[PDB]
């Protein structure tokens, strides 16, 4: 009756390329994550993550370039600081902060993208349904 709802927000220049490379190389993984594709992860506002979690994302993933490998010289440092602060907010509002993570996937790491997909799915399955969906009523 329950299937995890995981949302990914992946940059265009390394994480979308890595997911595309995994697909091209035919690396299988479970069909639980759906992606949004912004240009950089610097674009990811905090309110995007919080909006996802309040609509009912059982998990949220944000994937971007490695440090020093952003297409736009430093846009993922901003995203990293923002996601550290988001981890702190979710812990202090009492939602489980491991529902959220930020992975750094390069353009050539299709295998690592597959492993990230598998691990995110496993972690959310262990965690269970998000509590917001029943706390709303």
């Amino acid at each position: 009756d329950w299937k995890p709802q995981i949302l990914a927000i992946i940059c265009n220049w390394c994480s979308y390329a890595g997911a595309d490379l995994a697909g091209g190389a035919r690396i299988q993984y479970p069909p639980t994550v759906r992606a949004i594709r912004v240009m950089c992860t610097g674009r990811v506002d905090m309110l995007f993550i919080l909006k996802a979690f309040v609509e009912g994302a059982d998990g949220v993933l944000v994937s971007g370039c490695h440090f020093g490998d952003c297409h736009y010289l430093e846009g993922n440092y901003k995203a990293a600081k923002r996601m550290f602060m988001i981890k702190n907010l979710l812990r202090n509002i009492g939602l489980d902060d491991r529902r959220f993570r930020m992975t750094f996937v390069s353009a050539s790491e299709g295998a690592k993208w597959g492993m990230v997909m598998e691990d995110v799915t496993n972690t959310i399955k262990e965690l269970g349904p998000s509590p917001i969906k029943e706390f709303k009523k």
Partner: protein, 662 residues
């Protein structure tokens, strides 16, 4: 809004993983969708015709194509959307192949169908909120810059100049030419390197469209495809060219290259052109065939004795108090041609490079064998100056090595140049024998295999075994090379008079600093990265910057020149047009929402944001040319006063909302 959804089968690549009929029916029942339809190859001419007919018939506001990746087929379907009466940017893709089919092929079909329905729903939600953009066209300055004065830089500069574009040639060293100027002969044809290159050096030095700036570096670069504001450091050469002397007022001239200055200078230092084997004064030229024959002064080693100025006399070319001058130049495109250096092979201690006298590397051997080198072209042993009779060549020295000391790649030309050096010794010293300790002879190019055949015919010994270690005889200074003859099946101990290491090559010194100034990334190997490894080996991901030569990866002089002319052509494409279109992803400030806090200003790596006066209120101002569309500022601004043109917050939030719609 009225959206059309067109679902490609990709010729069973997608229909063999999901139910295309079900996806199409779901798209029909989706809100805002006017028409939903499918085709086998939406990227083909009937597919574009299908899109255009649907647009005309159903009065479509936007188009959603559920197909392969945007990174593969945005231009195709944007042009298909334009041809049909829409804006190109009323279009959005739903990647349901490379992120649904190819990853959910096996044993899971209704799950892939549900994922496809979700992706189509999110794409439709974004496209129902996209609106019209027009790409920005920016003028292109009609100059070009070439950093590097090697063969690849000189070829690119000559190509651009003869195409008519004014070109700057920046070289850090006092002369152009590069490594090929150090080479003595060239494989596979055995031509003299300077003889074949001097004609082209003279062309570069005389061309009216080339601004040859030797002994100069690139301090900083800012700008974009349109205008690059490049600041150059004119290092204190210490000697004036005739033009500069006349400008400063000395009618008698500047430097004519007589040599009296270096005849009287008392300081003696190693010559970097001769890899240190030869002396040169504090005021010097590398070799007698340098293109600007202008006699740099080495200020780190000059003692300001003033004998040089007395020798120069009325020419008055020497200014011992000269300082680093800075110049700012505006250019349209830039070509990077930084070349390479030899990997430090003293780290491989088993081959006693620095510790045994008679172990040298291949550029030192090339200078020793050249007739213009420290010797009279006579190869002699460094230990005692006697002529060798047995010479060993250690191929793969520091290459195809996964131990962390050497390089894991092949340096491409080291098998060929070792064959050349074996030929040169066997023909220059009568009765000398060349031993090549090899592990995969790689003679792949045109006439290379024939060159290999000819060298074996002249009588070089080919021992298939990577050298294990080298011991030096204590008295004769001879070198005992220990390896196994893998084909013979026995260990060997070959005693040679001279050992030559075919060392790996690595990016030149400072190349990483320069490519970070220009915004270029690096490869896995450490060389500069190209836009697409197959179909675009010259351009980089940053627009207006192009690669040429060994700086992108090791190559022979033929391949280097082909790459250099390719880069010159790519750099000429936007200059000849004079216009270039930027991608309309810019940030646009909504002024009657900006509060003027100024906090976003420091979040732009490109300094596109600033605080300015509009209607008395201090608001933020975007230099739309400098913006690159990253979105950092617009993801920061708390009040939502920054709009990202094709990835607006309402659009992204509509995608999120559509994902959670059930």
């Amino acid at each position: 809004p009225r959206i059309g959804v067109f679902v490609c089968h990709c010729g069973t690549n997608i229909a063999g993983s999901m139910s295309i009929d079900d996806v199409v029916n779901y798209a029909k029942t989706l809100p805002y969708v006017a028409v939903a339809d499918q085709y086998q190859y939406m990227c083909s001419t009937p597919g574009q015709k299908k899109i255009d007919d649907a647009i005309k018939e159903y009065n479509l506001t936007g188009v959603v194509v559920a197909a392969c990746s945007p990174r593969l087929h945005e231009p195709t379907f944007r042009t298909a959307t334009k041809e049909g009466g829409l804006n190109p940017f009323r279009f959005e893709m739903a990647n349901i192949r490379e992120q649904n089919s190819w990853v959910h092929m096996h044993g899971m079909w209704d799950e892939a169908t549900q994922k496809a329905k979700d992706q189509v729903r999110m794409a439709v939600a974004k496209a129902a909120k996209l609106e019209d953009l027009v790409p920005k066209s920016v003028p292109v300055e009609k100059t070009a810059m070439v950093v590097g004065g090697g063969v690849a830089g000189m070829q690119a500069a000559l190509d651009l100049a003869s195409a008519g574009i004014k070109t700057y040639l920046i070289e850090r060293t006092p002369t152009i030419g590069g490594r090929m100027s150090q080479l003595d002969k060239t494989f596979p044809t055995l031509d003299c390197s300077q003889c074949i290159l001097t004609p082209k050096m003279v062309d570069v030095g005389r061309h009216p469209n080339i601004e040859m700036m030797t002994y100069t570096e690139v301090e900083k670069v800012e700008g974009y495809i349109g205008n690059f504001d490049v600041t150059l450091r004119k290092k204190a050469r210490g000697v004036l060219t005739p033009t500069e002397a006349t400008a400063k007022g000395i009618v008698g001239g500047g430097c004519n290259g007589c040599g009296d200055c270096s005849a009287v200078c008392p300081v003696i230092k190693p010559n970097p052109f001769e890899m240190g084997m030869a002396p040169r004064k504090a005021i010097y030229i590398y070799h007698a065939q340098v293109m600007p024959l202008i006699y740099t002064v080495d200020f780190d080693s000059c003692v300001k004795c003033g004998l040089c100025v007395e020798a120069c006399g009325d020419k008055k070319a020497i200014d011992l108090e000269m300082q680093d001058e800075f110049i700012t130049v505006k250019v349209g495109t830039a070509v990077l041609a930084t070349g390479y250096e030899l990997f430090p092979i003293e780290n491989k201690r088993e081959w006693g490079y620095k510790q045994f006298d008679n172990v040298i590397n291949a550029l030192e051997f090339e200078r020793l064998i050249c007739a213009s080198g420290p010797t009279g072209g006579h190869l002699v042993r460094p230990s005692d100056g006697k002529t060798p009779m047995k010479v060993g060549f250690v191929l793969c020295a520091g290459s195809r090595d996964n131990t962390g000391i050497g390089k894991p790649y092949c340096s491409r030309f080291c098998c060929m140049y070792s064959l050349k050096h074996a030929h040169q010794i066997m023909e220059k010293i009568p009765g000398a024998v060349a031993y090549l300790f090899y592990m995969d002879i790689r003679s792949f190019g045109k006439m290379y295999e024939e060159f290999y055949y000819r060298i074996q015919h002249e009588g070089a010994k080919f021992i298939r075994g990577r050298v294990a270690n080298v011991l030096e005889d204590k008295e004769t200074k001879n070198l005992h090379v220990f390896t196994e003859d893998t084909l013979l099946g026995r260990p060997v101990d070959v005693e040679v008079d001279l050992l030559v290491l075919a060392a790996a090559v690595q990016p030149n010194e400072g190349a990483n600093e320069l490519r970070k100034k220009f915004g270029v990334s690096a490869s896995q190997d450490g060389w500069m990265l190209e836009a697409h490894p197959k179909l675009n080996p010259c351009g980089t991901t940053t627009a207006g910057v192009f690669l040429a030569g060994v700086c992108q990866g090791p190559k022979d002089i033929p391949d280097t020149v082909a790459q250099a002319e390719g880069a010159a052509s790519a750099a000429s494409i936007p200059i000849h047009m004079g216009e270039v279109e930027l991608e309309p992803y810019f940030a646009m400030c909504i002024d009657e929402l900006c509060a003027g806090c100024g906090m976003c200003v420091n979040l732009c790596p490109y300094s596109a944001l600033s605080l300015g006066e509009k209607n008395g209120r201090t608001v933020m101002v975007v230099t739309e040319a400098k913006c690159k569309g990253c979105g950092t500022c617009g993801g920061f601004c708390p009040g939502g006063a920054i709009k990202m043109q094709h990835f607006t917050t309402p659009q992204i939030v509509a995608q999120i909302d559509a994902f959670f719609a059930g």
